[PDB]
Amino acid sequence: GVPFFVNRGGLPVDEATWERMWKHVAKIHPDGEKVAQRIRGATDLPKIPIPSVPTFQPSTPVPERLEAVQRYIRELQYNHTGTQFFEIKKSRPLTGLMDLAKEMTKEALPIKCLEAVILGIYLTNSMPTLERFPISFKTYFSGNYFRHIVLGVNFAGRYGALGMSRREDLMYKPPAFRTLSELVLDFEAAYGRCWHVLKKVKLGQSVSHDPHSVEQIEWKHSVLDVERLGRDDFRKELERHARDMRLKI
Amino acid sequence: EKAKQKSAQQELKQRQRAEIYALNRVMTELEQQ
Numbered sequence: 001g002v003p004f005f006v007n008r009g010g011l012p013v014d015e016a017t018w019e020r021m022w023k024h025v026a027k028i029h030p031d032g033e034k035v036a037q038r039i040r041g042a043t044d045l046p047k048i049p050i051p052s053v054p055t056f057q058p059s060t061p062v063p064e065r066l067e068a069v070q071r072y073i074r075e076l077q078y079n080h081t082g083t084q085f086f087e088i089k090k091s092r093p094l095t096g097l098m099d100l101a102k103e104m105t106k107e108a109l110p111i112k113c114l115e116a117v118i119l120g121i122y123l124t125n126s127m128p129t130l131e132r133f134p135i136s137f138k139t140y141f142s143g144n145y146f147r148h149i150v151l152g153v154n155f156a157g158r159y160g161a162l163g164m165s166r167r168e169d170l171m172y173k174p175p176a177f178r179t180l181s182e183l184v185l186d187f188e189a190a191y192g193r194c195w196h197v198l199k200k201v202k203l204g205q206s207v208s209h210d211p212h213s214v215e216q217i218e219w220k221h222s223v224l225d226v227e228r229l230g231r232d233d234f235r236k237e238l239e240r241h242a243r244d245m246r247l248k249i
Numbered sequence: 250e251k252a253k254q255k256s257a258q259q260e261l262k263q264r265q266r267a268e269i270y271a272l273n274r275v276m277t278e279l280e281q282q
């Protein structure tokens with residue numbers, strides 16, 4: 001899709017990556033140089049509260065906990081700076097990704113969709129009756145392809161999603177959809193309303209609730225070519241994926 | 250002097266975080282309209 005830079009050296013951001021971030025800002029913002037000159041070195045900038053990591057009473061129903069998890073994710077803000085602040089190697093053992101999610105909560109910087117998936121896993125490992133599985137969507141608009149990922153969830157046989165997007169309709173879904181197909185079709189319709197064609201859906205397996213697991217997340221357990229499949233086989237493949245997940249414990 | 254070195258690192262992160270969020274507000278407003 002559209003390229004972006006990634007901070008690959010931890011925090012604080014190293015000098016070269018920091019300059020690269022501002023050079024990118026000066027390129028794409030019509031007032032890019034003036035923006036840097038106002039912000040860089042300024043001593044009167046707002047203090048940003050560090051968002052409080054939500055903790056849950058055992059009497060609180062899981063869907064209410066998920067609302068709080070999503071509110072926390074949103075509080076960090078979608079990262080529009082052009083530089084991703086945490087590097088996510090998707091094939092890392094879960095325990096390493098959970099260490100990274102912990103650092104996201106300590107450092108409290110803006111994030112994009114994949115970081116939010118990792119954070120959503122970290123913040124729901126305390127909910128063993130909730131199953132979590134990544135859902136990636138590839139869409140098409142005006143000659144370019146777009147990649148998006150959310151954390152699908154299943155509570156008591158109902159499907160929803162957590163995550164981060166620059167669009168309000170492409171992240172949070174309360175766990176109320178009767179079937180996985182209905183959840184994915186809702187995302188497809190949301191994409192269509194903002195004129196994106198849904199091309200591929202990639203669904204992962206259920207993710208362990210053990211933050212010290214050495215297992216990898218299995219991102220691409222089902223890879224569905226929406227137009228090639230057509231409507232009926234699309235639904236059947238999503239039903240099959242939902243069954244596959246019910247058996248991974 | 251390890252406690253002071255961590256202090257300098259934490260201050261670096263604080264100054265950077267404030268600039269990141271100030272920049273993010275500007276770029277968010279640009280991305281929207």
Ligand SMILES: *[C@@H](C(=O)N[C@@H](Cc1ccc(O)cc1)C(=O)O)[C@@H](O)C(=O)OCC
Nearest residue numbers: 112113114146147148149164165166167
């Ligand atoms: C995934 C991510 O943040 N994806 C973007 C996808 C997108 C949607 C709509 C428009 O107009 C542009 C882009 C999102 O959900 O906002 C994240 O890991 C990522 O960096 O993907 C590339 C943007």
